[PDB]
Amino acid sequence: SRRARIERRTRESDIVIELDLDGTGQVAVDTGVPFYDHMLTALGSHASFDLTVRATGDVEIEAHHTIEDTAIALGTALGQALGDKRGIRRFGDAFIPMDETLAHAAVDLSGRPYCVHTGEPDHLQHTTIAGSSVPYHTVINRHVFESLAANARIALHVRVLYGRDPHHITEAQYKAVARALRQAVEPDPRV
Amino acid sequence: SRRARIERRTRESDIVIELDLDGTGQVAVDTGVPFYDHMLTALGSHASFDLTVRATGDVEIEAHHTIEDTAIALGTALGQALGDKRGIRRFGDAFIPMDETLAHAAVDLSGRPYCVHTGEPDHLQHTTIAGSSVPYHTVINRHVFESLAANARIALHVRVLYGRDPHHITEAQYKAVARALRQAVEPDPRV
Amino acid sequence: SRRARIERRTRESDIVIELDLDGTGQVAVDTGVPFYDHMLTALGSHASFDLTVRATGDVEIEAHHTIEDTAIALGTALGQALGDKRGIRRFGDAFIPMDETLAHAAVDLSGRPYCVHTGEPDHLQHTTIAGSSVPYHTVINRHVFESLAANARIALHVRVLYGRDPHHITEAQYKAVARALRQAVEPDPRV
Amino acid sequence: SRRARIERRTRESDIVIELDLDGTGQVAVDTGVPFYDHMLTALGSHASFDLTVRATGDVEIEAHHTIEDTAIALGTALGQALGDKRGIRRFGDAFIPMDETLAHAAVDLSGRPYCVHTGEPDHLQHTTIAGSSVPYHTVINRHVFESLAANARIALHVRVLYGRDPHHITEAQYKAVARALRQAVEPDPRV
Amino acid sequence: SRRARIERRTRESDIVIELDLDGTGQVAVDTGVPFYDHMLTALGSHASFDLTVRATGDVEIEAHHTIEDTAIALGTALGQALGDKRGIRRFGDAFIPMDETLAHAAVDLSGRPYCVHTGEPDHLQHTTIAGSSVPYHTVINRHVFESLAANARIALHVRVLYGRDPHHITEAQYKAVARALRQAVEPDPRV
Amino acid sequence: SRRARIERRTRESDIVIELDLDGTGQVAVDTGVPFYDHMLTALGSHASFDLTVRATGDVEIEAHHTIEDTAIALGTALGQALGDKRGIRRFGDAFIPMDETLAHAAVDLSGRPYCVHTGEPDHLQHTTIAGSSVPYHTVINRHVFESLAANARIALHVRVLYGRDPHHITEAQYKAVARALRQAVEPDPRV
Numbered sequence A, B, C, D, E, F: 001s002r003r004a005r006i007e008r009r010t011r012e013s014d015i016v017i018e019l020d021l022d023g024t025g026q027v028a029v030d031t032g033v034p035f036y037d038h039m040l041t042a043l044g045s046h047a048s049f050d051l052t053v054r055a056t057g058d059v060e061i062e063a064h065h066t067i068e069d070t071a072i073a074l075g076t077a078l079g080q081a082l083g084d085k086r087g088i089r090r091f092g093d094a095f096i097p098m099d100e101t102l103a104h105a106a107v108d109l110s111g112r113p114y115c116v117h118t119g120e121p122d123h124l125q126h127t128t129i130a131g132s133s134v135p136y137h138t139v140i141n142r143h144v145f146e147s148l149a150a151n152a153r154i155a156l157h158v159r160v161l162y163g164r165d166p167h168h169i170t171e172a173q174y175k176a177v178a179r180a181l182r183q184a185v186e187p188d189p190r191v
Ligand SMILES: [Mn+2]
Pocket: A064, A068, A143, C099, C168
């Protein structure tokens, strides 16, 4: 059994994560940041995890703290659920084409904690994805991946090969991480 | 069962496509353009499709119309044979080394219809592959991929990482698409 | 005793500042601009001040006037609480690493009123930090530091050595100013 | 059964290779060049081969001859163990993240003998990895891959996408080749 | 009491670390890599730690694994000895002039795990410091700092402002980290 | 007791220095070069030294010889007063903001004799600070610092980060050296 429940309570936020690595994409994410919900829902589903995320934070300031605390907690949940990491595929990668965008992620689940994030166009450093609720600043993409990798204690390399639309660029990256994780997480019948 | 028979009759050409996604590489291609036959035969075989292509067109003008009409028909056949696309791997990619050439393709079979074609050296914009029959102008490579993606309604990203020989560059690309499709087409035991 | 209460009432805003230089980080900031609240709370806490800030302004226009009026009032409070500035360390500086960001501030509390703000990446000239309330335009960072220095009548040099995330860049700067002030404010046992 | 025993005796060196393609990572490598031992041990293990390498050569001159003769012999063993190459996956690739380094390899086991090695930073042309024994000059990395590909008669493309540490860069490449081989070597249930 | 004993046993190495944050510079380091011993001895002494390091590793390959495993273990010891980190100075920085070299380090002991290493001249990417024993490749400097920061879970920013001699550049950096840690580790009489 | 009296009599000048490291800023400087007097008075006061400087030299030629002989003598006095340098902070640095100018100095009192002087704008190579008496050529700034460091036998790194006014640039540097010395000179309760 590869499950983890993480409860993270800070001054900024209140997080509950329930994670099953061997799931069927049963995902419910509620952080108060709907685009982030969309991204983590995509992450959970495409990784074929079962994932519940319940988060309430200081979104009056902005999404940052909640986003970061959630990523930390999710990272911790991933590492805990992984356990000894014996007999797994360990390495995984995936390409995600999304209209004009092509993104890629590669992981080593038993490698030293590390994150390299490259290729993301410069305008995503100051782009806001905004709806009727709390907005999402795409500059946080790197932060999410770094927080995930550091707390799951994995090597995570995320690349944007090319792209234009910030929604496409961001979603393709989350999905790339997701499917890279899904491959690496699988039992390896020869290891 | 994931089969399709497409009959496409235009002023320019006459096309019959029989496609089985779950084949064993039983391929017979006859378009009147032998290098194109070679490319679609490679595509069918490396995708592990069963594929019959019968095409007669206005090759007195040049191969373009026949090539395009065939790609459209084949795309339509791929989309039809795919059906609802439920329970499939959906995403697929493949690297094809061919001597000095390295090509890559990535697909999303349930993504919006889109094609990105990059990295092909500039001389392929005006290169002709010529034998004893109707020649093949490599500038058409992009056209084929665009027609396939638009009519199969899939996201197809084809890259040449590097290469020199136009035959190698072209064949590696068709083979990359082929094996990307083969991976994406597979039943996914977790979806 | 090094305390000051400043009441500043303009057409744009209504400000009350209570400041104790020799505090324990007892801080409550409410300006109607939650990210600014976060920044001044960080400033008060890391400076080891006791600080209460109550501000209501024309946030329907934007945060600018409130932010500026608050910084002016806080500057005035700092200068008043400083008094004759006898027997204090006078000079102070601090480095603040915050993930990828490194910020620095240096102060001369008995120097001529002056502010130099350098190194902040160009995208912060047009970046918005936005939550569920009144947003914060990072272009105002310099304005805050200039208003503080001019009204406290101190020399304040704020540098960003490098950074990417606008939240990190901004917070590291406020914290750098805070800890620079804390050092400079201390009694000097040899002066 | 896909096994090979190669004995290679030249003026420069004395090599014994025992290879099983369908192994469990039972690896013992002893060439007199300990970093090279480390690399071939990583290669054997990550390829899921069973591999024994016993080599004694003119390491008083330097590691080159031994390294090259070993790579030639290992290549020959790989080609011999492959046999007719019927019913195998044929193509294989793998990404290896190693801290700051990302490496990639792609193979065609039934392609013409060819090696392309790109992306390795310029300082590896003159870098030495040195311990208490015979050192390893990283300039030899390309030589190893070229010798392997030429003697196994396979198409091998090795890329460094980025990296800094010569140990990371080198090991990630050997591991990339290893896992590319492992994928390509697998029986293909549809071919 | 702020002490930690860490025993780390991997396939590559065997490490014992005894650390006292509140020491008097009683330091004994023995890793089999004498320049590394010199660096960690400088680190322990200038941080005013009491530190014993006993390490035996695969130095026949090179110093890398031993160096890295030691840095990981030392990082873990630092984090464990830090405990809840309550009432400490938290932030610390130091400049180290060493002949022509000026180095700097800044830390946040309660910040998120992060390392930024900048300014080191390009020739240190391929420089070897060699004596009568196992040599030290200066490219590993960054690796050490990254491993320390990641495992101590601290924010560590190391800069070389300028320098020429690789021994000076390296030692000044270790000493900068040391004295930055010493400052940050101190009890803060106001926190 | 950390005091020194140096009498230096050359053909060019006649110098008497009385120095107390553990002073209260009781400073009297008279060299016949009033801006230099101002600089050494700032140096003595901000270092919290007790310092008397009496110098008469060949100011008819220019200030150079007197300035240099004074710096040599003062350096010698600093080194002599330092003694064995046991139990002192050893390292010290300070930032000095002065209107538009930011200067910095870092010292190692037990390091090898060395001086690095950087960042001073090019116009100070030929700037004269002139009053009603003997003028001061700012090109001499570097000379002063080099003479101080060489004769005190200390490592002294002086940087101008930025600035415009030659008076500000010069004074900020002397003050930076002063406060760097003051920090480094202090007893270290842990060494
Ligand atoms: Mn953050």
